């Protein structure tokens, strides 16, 4: 995250770290949506142009973390994967359309003060909160500049009007994506960066004071550049696939 701040303790208890076993390294962000399901970006697991295609057994899920590098004894929980599910129409060839995947955990994780699932939006919450100008919150352990943070970083960012998203890039933007960030003339700045991928863009509903994951960190052109915005997977638009996957497995 660039131009973010350190997270408060317990501020993002759904935050998940995807961790490579060997060499032990951060792979991406992710989120806890139930006691055995983790949501992430498809590209975190599968991206053939970069020869990336992880199998279950290559991965660990670290939940309840604050510190990036530290083993957080008695706080973090670490889980193994039972099964990876990638969106059958994830478009890795072209634009990362449908950049979403699920991970089922071998065993349920124990909720705690530091571990707690985020909600997934329903149509009304999405329609009510996914508006240009409304701010969301992005969290991760990614790069601070286009070095690395000591603890989880947080940044709040305004959703941007679809024409401004589209006019900011040469990539073809889909209804399965939204963009967020401040404009050059807005003074404020901030963005997701490499490492933040697969992490959550959440919003706090003013209707019932619950946190909802509206997006997934998906892609960007550099990080925190003027005139560029972060692009996020639109979670509500792919919820049917999500529900089906969970409803079936």
């Amino acid at each position: 995250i660039v131009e973010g701040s350190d997270a408060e303790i317990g501020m993002s208890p759904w935050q998940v770290m995807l961790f490579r076993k060997s060499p032990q390294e951060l792979l991406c962000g992710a989120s806890l949506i139930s006691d055995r399901w983790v949501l992430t970006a498809a590209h975190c697991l599968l991206y053939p142009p970069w020869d990336k295609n992880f199998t279950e057994n290559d991965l660990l899920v670290r939940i309840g973390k604050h510190s990036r590098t530290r083993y957080e004894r008695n706080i973090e929980k670490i889980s193994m994967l039972e099964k990876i599910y990638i969106h059958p129409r994830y478009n890795w060839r072209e634009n990362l359309d449908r950049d979403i995947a699920l991970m089922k955990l071998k065993k349920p994780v124990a909720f705690s003060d530091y571990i707690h699932p985020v909600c997934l939006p329903d149509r009304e919450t999405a329609a009510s909160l996914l508006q240009a100008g409304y701010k969301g919150r992005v969290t991760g352990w990614g790069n601070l500049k286009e070095g690395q943070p000591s603890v989880l970083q947080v940044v709040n960012l305004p959703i941007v009007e679809r024409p401004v998203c589209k006019d900011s890039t040469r990539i073809r933007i889909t209804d399965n994506m939204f963009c967020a960030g401040y404009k050059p003339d807005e003074g404020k700045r901030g963005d997701a960066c490499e490492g933040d991928s697969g992490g959550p863009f959440v919003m706090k509903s003013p209707f019932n004071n619950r946190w909802y994951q509206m997006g997934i960190v998906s892609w960007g052109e550099g990080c925190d550049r003027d005139g560029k915005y972060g692009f996020y997977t639109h979670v509500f638009r792919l919820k049917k696939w999500i529900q089906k996957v969970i409803d079936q497995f």
Binding site: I9, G10, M11, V118, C119, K135, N156, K204, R210
Partner: peptide, 27 residues
């Protein structure tokens, strides 16, 4: 169900230091 409610904030009625910036953007 109990989703989206943080033990250390909502469940205790404590606010984090920047959640109000989100609320204030909601219109």
């Amino acid at each position: 169900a109990d989703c989206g409610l943080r033990p250390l904030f909502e469940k205790k009625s404590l606010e984090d230091k920047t959640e109000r910036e989100l609320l204030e953007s909601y219109i």
